[PDB]
Design a protein around this ligand. Structure first.
Ligand SMILES: CC(=O)N[C@@H]1[C@@H](O)[C@H](O)[C@@H](CO)O[C@H]1O
Ligand SMILES: CC(=O)N[C@@H]1[C@@H](O)[C@H](O)[C@@H](CO)O[C@H]1O
Ligand SMILES: CC(=O)N[C@@H]1[C@@H](O)[C@H](O)[C@@H](CO)O[C@H]1O
Ligand SMILES: *[C@@H]1O[C@H](CO)[C@@H](O)[C@H](O)[C@H]1NC(C)=O
Lengths: 57, 50
């Protein structure tokens, strides 16, 4: 949504652009735009979705 | 200076004109061809037009 994706070498994070602040990537932090195949340089991952653990109750 | 991939720089520039950056990544090859072509028009424009 705002900021940019990065990896420390083994995990993937989003940070704001002007100050390193690693947030674990979620459906809150990100917006979808279709399937992968159009995007040059995309990478595989897990995006966390906070609703799915809550409705596990 | 901080290095950044140029397709990742233009995704910042598109946000700075209120266009969501997926409009760049879904069109990157097309945008690149338009920029490359437009610089080609500048070569011809300057080469002819004193
Ligand atoms: C994320 C991305 O663009 N990766 C490319 C990679 O696929 C290519 O093999 C290399 C050499 O051109 O340059 C970089
Ligand atoms: C850039 C990259 O890692 N792409 C892989 C792709 O080759 C694979 O088919 C897919 C299966 O989920 O996972 C992702
Ligand atoms: C000169 C010109 O604009 N040609 C367009 C091309 O750029 C576009 O990629 C294609 C899509 O089908 O349609 C045609
Ligand atoms: C990457 O970050 C995660 C969470 O801070 C940590 O568990 C992991 O050890 C880090 N790995 C490296 C290579 O820094």
């Amino acid at each position: 949504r705002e900021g940019v994706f990065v990896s420390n070498g083994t995990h993937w994070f989003v940070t704001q652009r002007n100050f390193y602040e690693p947030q674990i990537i979620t459906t809150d932090n990100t917006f979808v735009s279709g399937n992968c195949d159009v995007v040059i340089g995309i990478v595989n991952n897990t995006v966390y979705d906070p609703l799915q653990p809550e409705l596990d109750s | 200076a901080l290095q950044i991939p140029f397709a990742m720089q233009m995704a910042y520039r598109f946000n700075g004109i209120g266009v969501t950056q997926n409009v760049l990544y879904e069109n990157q090859k097309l945008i690149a061809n338009q920029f490359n072509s437009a610089i080609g028009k500048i070569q011809d424009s300057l080469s002819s037009t004193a």
